[PDB]
Write a protein that binds this ligand. Sequence first.
Ligand code: HEM
Length: 82
Amino acid sequence: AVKYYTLEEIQKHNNSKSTWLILHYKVYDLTKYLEEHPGGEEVLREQAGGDATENFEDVGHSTDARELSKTFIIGELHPDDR
Ligand code: HEM
């Protein structure tokens, strides 16, 4: 099965308690990853609640980073909002 979230609900997860962001139509909950991210937590918080695909690709993440990111997927962006 697959959980679909709307942009409206993803937008609410941008506070000290929860940080979600979208990458290639997939929703990631990075709340517990903020302090471990080699690129820092500031760059993640800034994109919280929205689509960070372009910024993510612009830096050119390694294969290992992409493989690791899959563990944080909680669902996908609702088809109607794409
Ligand atoms: C999906 C979660 C993400 C994971 C698992 C992740 C993982 C990593 C890892 C392992 C690195 C080290 C270099 C590499 O392996 O490519 C890195 C660097 C970096 N990441 Fe992420 N990242 C994620 C999301 C993001 C996002 C959304 C942004 C931008 C808004 C971001 C910005 C950066 C930057 C600026 C660096 C520093 C590159 C440098 O040293 O020049 N990351 N990330």
